[PDB]
Amino acid sequence: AFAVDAAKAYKDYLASGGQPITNCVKMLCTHTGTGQAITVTPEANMDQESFGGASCCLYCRCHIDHPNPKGFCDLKGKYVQIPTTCANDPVGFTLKNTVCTVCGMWKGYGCSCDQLREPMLQ
């Protein structure tokens, strides 16, 4: 049942002080986008940077199989929005974070599916 665990290896490498994967392809955009996590075109808002998806995927960059039966990539051919505070390590951000299946925003960085929404607006 042996299987290389690239995700854990990159996370441990970062915790040991390793330099993050570089040369992720940052795109020019208006920064007036929806702010969703992974889109068909750059959708960065004023607090995000948009990057070519393939260049921000650990599996694509390390030339490793994607960890799923169909070996499908959720980033290749799309644009990933990375919070500006995390744009120094887009590969680490995509690995460590999850896209909300309901609103399409990053959990903890845009998704407000769990907020109160108690007072309604006219």
Partner: protein, 292 residues
């Protein structure tokens, strides 16, 4: 001063009608570099300005558009130009890229190896090339011989090309082929104006020569333009991306015989209102040399 606000500068038509003697390209603004937006790579800036300029032309943009990109791999193993083309092109556009060495791409399909090993059973609507192969300043063959053949056999009528050239990386036959388009130019990106680099743009392929062009003389005309019209380095156009996306025109695609290409058809092709090719399944391959 006025050109600094543009994505770049296209060679004025009057240069195409001259017969200049070839000589060294000596740029006044050489050795310099423009102020790129924070964290933006030169390849992303350059492709953004090329697409900004292509937006001003009569490009055919059919539903299910087909685009092939040569010389797409960077020294770090990614594809910045491909990422820009995919941003620019309508969502769903089939995008294939290729280069000599391994790289990770956002393209629908990527072929690795000499471009001469690339085979496609289908025709394309747009060919982009960033391939570089310089060489005395005489016409260079190598990938230019392949791209001239690829244009004449795999470019749909109405299709367009943007092929990178420099003072030393050019081919007389490619300039001659520009005469097989309704219109053509040499476009210099403002972010790389300190380089002899330009994109030879062929707009709306007619499949036959509309004008006889002497490629050796036309490269000399191009160098004379670069030597006499200094272009100020500028990244200004990169800061406003509001009108960047290529507008999806839904250009008609039909499969006409070679004997059905009349003057009305040529006129529609020349306006960017028609693409002529079959719409079969897009199939590509990369030849592998077998040796033990």
């Amino acid at each position: 001063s006025s050109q600094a606000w543009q994505p770049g500068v296209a060679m004025p038509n009057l240069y195409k009608m001259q017969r200049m003697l070839l000589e060294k390209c000596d740029l006044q603004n050489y050795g310099d570099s423009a102020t790129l937006p924070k964290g933006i790579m030169m390849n992303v800036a350059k492709y953004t300005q090329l697409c900004q300029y292509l937006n001003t032309l009569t490009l055919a943009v059919p539903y299910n558009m087909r685009v092939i990109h040569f010389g797409a791999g960077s020294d770090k193993g990614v594809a910045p130009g491909t990422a820009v083309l995919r941003q620019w092109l309508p969502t769903g556009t089939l995008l294939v890229d290729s280069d000599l060495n391994d790289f990770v791409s956002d393209a629908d399909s990527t072929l690795i190896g000499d471009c001469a090993t690339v085979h496609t059973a289908n025709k394309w609507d747009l060919i982009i090339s960033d391939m570089y192969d310089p060489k005395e300043n005489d016409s260079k063959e190598g990938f230019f011989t392949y791209i001239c053949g690829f244009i004449q056999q795999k470019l749909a009528l109405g299709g367009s090309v943007a092929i990178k050239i420099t003072e030393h990386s050019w081919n007389a036959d490619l300039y001659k082929l520009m005469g097989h388009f309704a219109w053509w130019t040499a476009f210099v990106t403002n972010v790389n104006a300190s380089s002899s680099e330009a994109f030879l743009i062929g707009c709306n392929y007619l499949g036959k020569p509309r004008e006889q062009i002497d490629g050796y003389v036309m490269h000399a005309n191009y160098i004379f333009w670069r030597n006499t019209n200094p272009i100020q380095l500028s990244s200004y156009s990169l800061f406003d991306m509001s009108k960047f996306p290529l507008k999806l025109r839904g250009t008609a695609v039909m499969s006409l015989k070679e004997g059905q290409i009349n003057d009305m058809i040529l006129s529609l092709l020349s306006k960017g209102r028609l693409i002529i090719r079959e719409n079969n399944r897009v199939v590509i391959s990369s030849d592998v040399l077998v040796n033990n």
